């Protein structure tokens, strides 16, 4: 399922996705890390905060 960024997040790590409010992340799935999701944003697959992106219902 896709997700929409509601809060700006700065990727501290290399596997972290730098999500910006208003962006749509392709195929956002839930990871084994509480508060971390996996999706293709900005042309890269990374991990971003769960409370920063809202599922596209």
Curated annotation (Swiss-Prot):
It is found in: Cytoplasm, Cytoskeleton; Cell projection, Ruffle; Cell junction. It comes from the Eukaryota. Phosphorylated on tyrosine residues; probably by c-Abl, Fyn and c-Src. Expressed in podocytes (at protein level). Disruption phenotype: Death at 6 to 7 weeks of age from renal failure. Mice show defects in epithelial foot processes, accompanied by mesangial cell hyperplasia and extracellular matrix deposition. There is a cross-link at residue 57 (Glycyl lysine isopeptide (Lys-Gly) (interchain with G-Cter in SUMO2)). Residues 1-57 form the SH3 domain. Seems to act as an adapter protein between membrane proteins and the actin cytoskeleton. In collaboration with CBLC, modulates the rate of RET turnover and may act as regulatory checkpoint that limits the potency of GDNF on neuronal survival. Controls CBLC function, converting it from an inhibitor to a promoter of RET degradation. May play a role in receptor clustering and cytoskeletal polarity in the junction between T-cell and antigen-presenting cell. May anchor the podocyte slit diaphragm to the actin cytoskeleton in renal glomerolus. Also required for cytokinesis. Potential homodimerization is mediated by the coiled coil domain. Homodimer. Interacts with F-actin, PKD2, NPHS1 and NPHS2. Interacts with WTIP. Interacts with DDN; interaction is direct. Interacts (via SH3 2 domain) with CBL (via phosphorylated C-terminus). Interacts with BCAR1/p130Cas (via SH3 domain). Interacts with MVB12A and ARHGAP17. Interacts with ANLN, CD2 and CBLB. Interacts with PDCD6IP and TSG101. Interacts with RIN3. Interacts directly with RET (inactive) and CBLC; upon RET activation by GDNF suggested to dissociate from RET as CBLC:CD2AP complex. Interacts with CGNL1 and SH3BP1; probably part of a complex at cell junctions. This is CD2-associated protein. The chain holds residues 2 to 58 of 637 of the full protein.
